[PDB]
Swiss-Prot record, chain A:
Phosphorylated by cyclin A/CDK2 and CK1. Phosphorylation probably enhances transcriptional activity. Self-association induces phosphorylation. Phosphorylated by LMTK3 in vitro. Glycosylated; contains N-acetylglucosamine, probably O-linked. Nuclear hormone receptor. The steroid hormones and their receptors are involved in the regulation of eukaryotic gene expression and affect cellular proliferation and differentiation in target tissues. Ligand-dependent nuclear transactivation involves either direct homodimer binding to a palindromic estrogen response element (ERE) sequence or association with other DNA-binding transcription factors, such as AP-1/c-Jun, c-Fos, ATF-2, Sp1 and Sp3, to mediate ERE-independent signaling. Residues 1-241 are annotated as: Self-association. Widely expressed. Not expressed in the pituitary gland. Selective estrogen receptor modulators (SERMs), such as tamoxifen, raloxifene, toremifene, lasofoxifene, clomifene, femarelle and ormeloxifene, have tissue selective agonistic and antagonistic effects on the estrogen receptor (ER). They interfere with the ER association with coactivators or corepressors, mainly involving the AF-2 domain. This is Estrogen receptor. The modification Phosphotyrosine is found at Y232. The chain holds residues 306 to 546 of 595 of the full protein. 17beta-estradiol binds at E48, R89, H219. Belongs to the nuclear hormone receptor family. NR3 subfamily. Changing I81C: Loss of transmembrane localization, no effect on peripheral membrane localization. Impairs activation of estrogen-induced activation of NOS3 and production of nitric oxide. No effect on binding to ERES.
């Protein structure tokens, strides 16, 4: 039934599915150490993950997939989804990252963790780009849903008829979200030329969000913090429950 | 800028004309892996620099910004060329006409099959979409211009002017991509769907490049090398 939705109903579904804004652990000892900041950020990420699974299950077409394919997509996207949410939260705070309403950090505090100021700088540049483009909430939700469906679709094993069907379904849903993004842009008064230029501008930022995730993963490993990454089993458990 | 005055057909012609040749592995037929690929990629890089200088709009940038874009995009450009070459060889990667490898040969290298497998999947996707050569060159130029444009370290007026220019050129390639699709008979809906399909594969190419880099240092041209190669 997901591919029978209209553009306006897809928009409505995605806005209704949005997860809550969570708070960081209240009153930590400030200033931070590297260990304590990572501790606060890990704790917040672990709690956001549960709500991300709930959101994902309400993205039209996601639960049509096998549980295995749902986990693979989440495995592939989760850090990108957390990151774009952060960028969105931070749009109205130039020069700062709004990790939580009670955890607003500027660049110089990313220094307290080794290697994170580079990633801080990349996240701040993405928030500046979103601000420059006047990204709209309805566009953000579509972009976040694209990330979920797209990031892992190309690394499916995907060699049987069923898998061809799964990948085909994902690409049809992704076409529907493109239709939706274009509809939102037409309704706002953009010419056809402006519509296609803005769609491309938004999808190309996704490549930078990928980059940021890859570099973030690198450092969640460089700091010997691989047990911070949600396992296949954990993700599967959250999906079934 | 001359780039911003080009029609879609003039942009495609420019990019097709700039295409580099398909090089051969130096393997001697009448007579090992990583060196064959490194030697090949080294020779490909020289051609890439001269290709880049022919992408409309690229030479309007400062040399420093040209280098930054090449630094950020060179492995993704190599990869998309590989994937394009291998399109008509399902299950195989055509590194060169005399170096056609399948999974089994990817496993032998401690240079992983993980990346081999991701490249094959990109080739399958291109095949499945009937990717056209005119679309390919557009995509290769979008990688060059886009991959580095969010990581310029400067905030001078010039840096703002440079970023704006890159996005205007990128807008011209979008237009070009859409025109090609309209000329081919796609509906307005099919045009924007296919454009999105193409651009979202670029997120996977970025992923493969990042996994390839982390394998490469598990050889990469430095800023100074690229700069030297540029002013020539
Ligand atoms: O890649 S890193 O910068 C990464 C990015 C940012 O800081 C690190 C991080 C993070 C993620 C998971 C974790 O267990 C700890 C930290 C972030 C994060 C982003 C959004 C969000 O809602 C919560 C946390 N290390
Ligand atoms: O970085 S990797 O992905 C990379 C990708 C592919 O193989 C590695 C590689 C390569 C690049 C530069 C170099 O000095 C050596 C090797 C490739 C390549 C791609 C296109 C091209 O036109 C020329 C070379 N890698 C490690 C790697 C190594 C071995 C194998 Cl089998 C696959 C990937």
């Amino acid at each position: 039934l997901a591919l029978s939705l209209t553009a306006d109903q897809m928009v409505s579904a995605l806005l209704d599915a949005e997860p809550p804004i969570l708070y960081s652990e209240y009153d930590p000892t400030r200033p931070f150490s590297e260990a304590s900041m990572m501790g606060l950020l890990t704790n917040l990420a672990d709690r956001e993950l549960v709500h991300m699974i709930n959101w994902a299950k309400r993205v039209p077409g996601f639960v049509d997939l096998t549980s295995h394919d749902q986990v693979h997509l989440l495995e592939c996207a989760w850090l990108e989804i957390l990151m774009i949410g952060l960028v969105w939260r931070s749009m109205e705070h130039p020069g700062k990252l709004l990790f939580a309403p009670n955890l607003l950090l500027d660049r110089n505090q990313g220094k307290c963790v080794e290697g994170m100021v580079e990633i801080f700088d990349m996240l701040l540049a993405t928030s500046s780009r979103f601000r420059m483009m006047n990204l709209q909430g309805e566009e953000f939700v579509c972009l976040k849903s694209i990330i979920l469906l797209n990031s892992g679709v190309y690394t499916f094993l995907s060699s049987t008829l069923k898998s061809l069907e799964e990948k085909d379904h994902i690409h049809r849903v992704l076409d529907k979200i493109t239709d939706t993004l274009i509809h939102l842009m037409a309704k706002a008064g953009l010419t056809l030329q402006q519509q296609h230029q803005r769609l491309a501008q938004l999808l190309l930022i996704l490549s930078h969000i990928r980059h940021m995730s890859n570099k973030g993963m690198e450092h969640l490993y460089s700091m010997k913090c691989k047990n911070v990454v949600p396992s296949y089993d954990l993700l599967l458990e959250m999906l079934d429950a």
